[PDB]
Design an enzyme around this catalytic site. Structure first.
Site, PDB file in Angstrom:
ATOM      1  N   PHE A  53      44.151 -33.583  -9.118  1.00 59.66           N
ATOM      2  CA  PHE A  53      42.607 -32.792  -9.429  1.00 59.66           C
ATOM      3  C   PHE A  53      42.259 -32.163  -8.188  1.00 59.66           C
ATOM      4  CE2 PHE A  53      41.567 -34.246 -13.819  1.00 59.66           C
ATOM      5  CZ  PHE A  53      42.515 -35.163 -13.922  1.00 59.66           C
ATOM      6  N   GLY A  56      35.942 -27.640  -6.763  1.00 57.40           N
ATOM      7  CA  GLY A  56      35.202 -27.326  -5.568  1.00 57.40           C
ATOM      8  C   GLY A  56      35.760 -26.766  -4.465  1.00 57.40           C
ATOM      9  N   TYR A  58      37.625 -28.263  -2.510  1.00 58.24           N
ATOM     10  CA  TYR A  58      38.925 -29.170  -2.332  1.00 58.24           C
ATOM     11  C   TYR A  58      40.052 -27.954  -2.786  1.00 58.24           C
ATOM     12  CZ  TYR A  58      36.650 -33.536  -2.049  1.00 58.24           C
ATOM     13  OH  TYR A  58      35.740 -34.849  -1.940  1.00 58.24           O
ATOM     14  N   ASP A 144      45.117 -38.611  -5.583  1.00 58.00           N
ATOM     15  CA  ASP A 144      44.067 -37.668  -4.931  1.00 58.00           C
ATOM     16  C   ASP A 144      44.702 -36.588  -3.957  1.00 58.00           C
ATOM     17  OD1 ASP A 144      42.135 -39.420  -5.810  1.00 58.00           O
ATOM     18  OD2 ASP A 144      41.343 -40.094  -3.816  1.00 58.00           O
ATOM     19  N   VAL A 145      43.899 -35.333  -4.126  1.00 52.57           N
ATOM     20  CA  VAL A 145      44.443 -34.043  -3.536  1.00 52.57           C
ATOM     21  C   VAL A 145      44.310 -34.290  -1.990  1.00 52.57           C
ATOM     22  CG1 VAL A 145      42.287 -32.875  -3.640  1.00 52.57           C
ATOM     23  CG2 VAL A 145      44.717 -31.460  -3.712  1.00 52.57           C
ATOM     24  N   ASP A 146      43.282 -35.057  -1.483  1.00 52.12           N
ATOM     25  CA  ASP A 146      43.006 -34.877   0.133  1.00 52.12           C
ATOM     26  C   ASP A 146      44.010 -36.151   0.655  1.00 52.12           C
ATOM     27  OD1 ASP A 146      41.742 -37.557  -1.266  1.00 52.12           O
ATOM     28  OD2 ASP A 146      39.997 -37.311   0.079  1.00 52.12           O
ATOM     29  N   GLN A 166      45.355 -50.777  -0.298  1.00 52.77           N
ATOM     30  CA  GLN A 166      44.486 -50.049   0.423  1.00 52.77           C
ATOM     31  C   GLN A 166      44.743 -50.229   1.815  1.00 52.77           C
ATOM     32  OE1 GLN A 166      41.685 -49.350   2.386  1.00 52.77           O
ATOM     33  NE2 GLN A 166      40.264 -48.075   1.498  1.00 52.77           N
ATOM     34  N   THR A 178      35.960 -54.887  -1.363  1.00 54.45           N
ATOM     35  CA  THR A 178      34.940 -54.435  -1.957  1.00 54.45           C
ATOM     36  C   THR A 178      34.932 -54.156  -3.429  1.00 54.45           C
ATOM     37  OG1 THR A 178      35.775 -52.202  -1.562  1.00 54.45           O
ATOM     38  CG2 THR A 178      34.563 -52.978   0.234  1.00 54.45           C
ATOM     39  N   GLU A 236      37.576 -46.629  -8.711  1.00 50.64           N
ATOM     40  CA  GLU A 236      38.438 -47.658  -7.828  1.00 50.64           C
ATOM     41  C   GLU A 236      38.075 -48.979  -8.333  1.00 50.64           C
ATOM     42  OE1 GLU A 236      38.420 -48.215  -3.174  1.00 50.64           O
ATOM     43  OE2 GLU A 236      40.401 -47.102  -3.853  1.00 50.64           O
TER      44      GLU A 236
HETATM   45  O1  GDU Z   1      34.216 -32.489  -5.290  1.00 52.19           O
HETATM   46  C1  GDU Z   1      35.234 -33.157  -5.639  1.00 52.19           C
HETATM   47  C2  GDU Z   1      35.291 -34.532  -5.842  1.00 52.19           C
HETATM   48  C3  GDU Z   1      36.515 -35.332  -6.093  1.00 52.19           C
HETATM   49  N1  GDU Z   1      37.489 -34.601  -6.142  1.00 52.19           N
HETATM   50  C4  GDU Z   1      38.812 -35.393  -6.540  1.00 52.19           C
HETATM   51  O2  GDU Z   1      38.531 -36.763  -6.576  1.00 52.19           O
HETATM   52  C5  GDU Z   1      39.379 -37.557  -5.516  1.00 52.19           C
HETATM   53  C6  GDU Z   1      38.415 -38.536  -5.006  1.00 52.19           C
HETATM   54  O3  GDU Z   1      37.364 -37.850  -4.377  1.00 52.19           O
HETATM   55  P1  GDU Z   1      37.616 -38.238  -2.557  1.00 52.19           P
HETATM   56  O4  GDU Z   1      38.799 -38.147  -2.205  1.00 52.19           O
HETATM   57  O5  GDU Z   1      36.672 -37.257  -1.818  1.00 52.19           O
HETATM   58  O6  GDU Z   1      36.895 -39.572  -2.010  1.00 52.19           O
HETATM   59  P2  GDU Z   1      37.859 -40.903  -1.712  1.00 52.19           P
HETATM   60  O7  GDU Z   1      38.987 -40.564  -0.549  1.00 52.19           O
HETATM   61  O8  GDU Z   1      36.728 -41.906  -1.318  1.00 52.19           O
HETATM   62  O9  GDU Z   1      38.487 -41.363  -3.042  1.00 52.19           O
HETATM   63  C7  GDU Z   1      38.650 -42.781  -3.434  1.00 52.19           C
HETATM   64  O10 GDU Z   1      37.600 -43.507  -3.855  1.00 52.19           O
HETATM   65  C8  GDU Z   1      37.146 -42.752  -5.131  1.00 52.19           C
HETATM   66  C9  GDU Z   1      35.985 -43.594  -5.764  1.00 52.19           C
HETATM   67  O11 GDU Z   1      34.773 -43.187  -5.155  1.00 52.19           O
HETATM   68  C10 GDU Z   1      38.462 -42.799  -6.167  1.00 52.19           C
HETATM   69  O12 GDU Z   1      38.421 -44.311  -6.727  1.00 52.19           O
HETATM   70  C11 GDU Z   1      39.582 -42.130  -5.554  1.00 52.19           C
HETATM   71  O13 GDU Z   1      40.695 -42.370  -6.366  1.00 52.19           O
HETATM   72  C12 GDU Z   1      39.958 -42.789  -4.304  1.00 52.19           C
HETATM   73  O14 GDU Z   1      41.093 -42.281  -3.646  1.00 52.19           O
HETATM   74  C13 GDU Z   1      39.582 -36.382  -4.479  1.00 52.19           C
HETATM   75  O15 GDU Z   1      40.864 -36.712  -3.904  1.00 52.19           O
HETATM   76  C14 GDU Z   1      39.927 -35.150  -5.556  1.00 52.19           C
HETATM   77  O16 GDU Z   1      41.312 -35.225  -6.034  1.00 52.19           O
HETATM   78  C15 GDU Z   1      37.583 -33.407  -6.134  1.00 52.19           C
HETATM   79  O17 GDU Z   1      38.539 -32.573  -6.193  1.00 52.19           O
HETATM   80  N2  GDU Z   1      36.317 -32.570  -5.770  1.00 52.19           N
HETATM   81  O1  LIG Z   2      36.477 -50.139   0.286  1.00 48.84           O
HETATM   82  C1  LIG Z   2      36.854 -49.255  -0.550  1.00 48.84           C
HETATM   83  C2  LIG Z   2      36.771 -47.789   0.145  1.00 48.84           C
HETATM   84  O2  LIG Z   2      37.214 -47.874   1.303  1.00 48.84           O
HETATM   85  C3  LIG Z   2      36.922 -46.525   2.311  1.00 48.84           C
HETATM   86  O3  LIG Z   2      37.331 -46.805   3.489  1.00 48.84           O
HETATM   87  C4  LIG Z   2      36.674 -47.212   4.398  1.00 48.84           C
HETATM   88  C5  LIG Z   2      36.825 -48.612   4.552  1.00 48.84           C
HETATM   89  O4  LIG Z   2      36.257 -49.362   3.334  1.00 48.84           O
HETATM   90  C6  LIG Z   2      35.923 -49.175   5.876  1.00 48.84           C
HETATM   91  O5  LIG Z   2      36.270 -50.625   5.972  1.00 48.84           O
HETATM   92  C7  LIG Z   2      36.210 -48.391   7.195  1.00 48.84           C
HETATM   93  O6  LIG Z   2      35.374 -48.602   8.127  1.00 48.84           O
HETATM   94  O7  LIG Z   2      36.180 -47.015   6.584  1.00 48.84           O
HETATM   95  C8  LIG Z   2      37.138 -46.236   5.902  1.00 48.84           C
HETATM   96  C9  LIG Z   2      36.663 -44.967   5.651  1.00 48.84           C
HETATM   97  O8  LIG Z   2      35.575 -44.650   5.218  1.00 48.84           O
HETATM   98  C10 LIG Z   2      37.692 -45.530   1.619  1.00 48.84           C
HETATM   99  O9  LIG Z   2      37.378 -44.280   2.361  1.00 48.84           O
HETATM  100  C11 LIG Z   2      37.095 -45.348   0.154  1.00 48.84           C
HETATM  101  O10 LIG Z   2      37.862 -44.255  -0.634  1.00 48.84           O
HETATM  102  C12 LIG Z   2      37.291 -46.607  -0.807  1.00 48.84           C
HETATM  103  O11 LIG Z   2      38.600 -46.800  -0.825  1.00 48.84           O
HETATM  104 CO    CO Z   3      40.359 -39.642  -1.531  1.00 50.32          CO
END
Ligand code: GDU
Ligand SMILES: OC[C@H]1O[C@@H](O[C@H]2[C@H](O)[C@@H](O)[C@H](O)O[C@@H]2CO)[C@H](O)[C@@H](O)[C@H]1O
Ligand code: CO
Length: 278
Positions: A53, A56, A58, A144-146, A166, A178, A236
């Site tokens: 996905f 925005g 992204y 995730d795309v990022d 993780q 967490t 998550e």
């Molecule tokens: O504005 C946005 C928000 C989210 N995303 C999609 O949603 C995913 C998750 O958002 P982020 O990558 O910005 O955030 P995180 O790295 O924190 O994501 C992690 O935590 C999330 C919950 O907060 C989900 O569980 C996700 O699968 C996990 O990789 C993105 O990769 C993207 O594919 C978008 O494309 N645009």
């Molecule tokens: O805990 C789930 C949450 O982890 C984030 O990663 C954090 C990590 O938890 C923290 O200990 C460290 O200090 O920073 C990391 C980066 O913010 C992930 O970013 C989030 O997507 C969830 O997976």
């Molecule tokens: Co992500």
């Protein structure tokens, strides 16, 4: 047919966890024989799917790096279909795909909250599994795309249900995970319970199992919202609750989803995929 001994040797990585109490392998660099699996899966004539996905800002930026790296490293040697979900299809960039790779693009209605964008993935993935993906691929990954592939991400990762460790927590004590800790949430996990903390940035399996993953997570997301509560880490948290109750048949080491902001300890022999900056 295929047995763990044919392709997996846990004793080649003695300093890390390679097997679970429910008999699932934890795939670390050096433990797997990709050549045996390539030949095994090529006989079967498998096709692997990959959903991503991008909504925005992204859309044009991460998606280019994601798809470019994916075409380079994801399941090389076998047919692949990329399923791309976007809010405005005009942002979809043009990535030249290699042999046996193709894609399909779908326009999705973007949600208001960034948390619902991430969580609404669960419903959308299930809909497309029923509609067509179940007939198009034998295994499916949702990512995730990022993030960006850095090396071969191949058939050693395939299984009925695949979870990702993780990177920040794979050596941590379960009481420090967490997890969602409020008994009021469907994702609740008590202290002293839990096997690993799985990363929602990568999960996969057969279309059947991925449907159950996304349907059960989405139902928990739904029940929670109907009680005006949102899990600590949104989808998550629900994914970790799901994998606690329905053990994954395969786990990928943090090498398959590494955050270089951690550094590069000796446990990480060869990164297959790395986080993008958040
Ligand atoms: O504005 C946005 C928000 C989210 N995303 C999609 O949603 C995913 C998750 O958002 P982020 O990558 O910005 O955030 P995180 O790295 O924190 O994501 C992690 O935590 C999330 C919950 O907060 C989900 O569980 C996700 O699968 C996990 O990789 C993105 O990769 C993207 O594919 C978008 O494309 N645009
Ligand atoms: O805990 C789930 C949450 O982890 C984030 O990663 C954090 C990590 O938890 C923290 O200990 C460290 O200090 O920073 C990391 C980066 O913010 C992930 O970013 C989030 O997507 C969830 O997976
Ligand atoms: Co992500």
């Amino acid at each position: 047919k295929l047995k763990l001994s044919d392709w997996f040797n846990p004793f080649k990585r003695p300093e890390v966890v390679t097997m679970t109490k429910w008999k699932a392998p934890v795939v670390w660099e050096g433990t797997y024989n990709r050549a045996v699996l390539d030949n095994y899966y090529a006989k079967q004539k498998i096709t692997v799917g990959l959903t991503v996905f991008a909504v925005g800002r992204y859309i044009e930026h991460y998606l280019e790096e994601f798809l470019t790296s994916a075409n380079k490293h994801f399941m090389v040697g076998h047919p692949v279909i990329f399923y791309i979900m976007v809010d405005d299809v005009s942002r979809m960039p043009l990535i030249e795909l290699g042999p046996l790779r193709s894609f399909k693009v779908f326009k999705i209605k973007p949600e208001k909250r960034w948390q619902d964008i991430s969580m609404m993935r669960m419903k959308t993935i299930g809909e497309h599994i029923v509609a067509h993906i179940q007939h198009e691929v034998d295994f499916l990954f949702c990512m995730d795309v990022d993030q960006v592939f850095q090396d071969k991400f191949g058939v050693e990762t395939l299984g009925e249900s695949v979870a990702q460790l993780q990177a920040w927590w794979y050596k941590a004590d379960p009481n420090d995970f967490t997890y969602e800790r409020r008994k009021e949430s469907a994702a609740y996990i008590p202290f002293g319970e839990g096997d690993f903390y799985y990363h929602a940035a990568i999960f996969g399996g057969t279309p059947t199992q991925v449907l159950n993953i996304t349907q059960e997570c989405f139902k928990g997301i739904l029940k929670d919202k109907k009680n005006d509560i949102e899990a600590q880490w949104h989808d998550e948290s629900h994914l970790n609750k799901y994998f606690l109750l329905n053990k994954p048949t395969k786990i990928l080491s943090p090498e398959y989803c590494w955050d270089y902001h951690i550094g590069l300890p000796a446990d990480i022999k060869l990164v297959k995929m790395s986080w993008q900056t958040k």
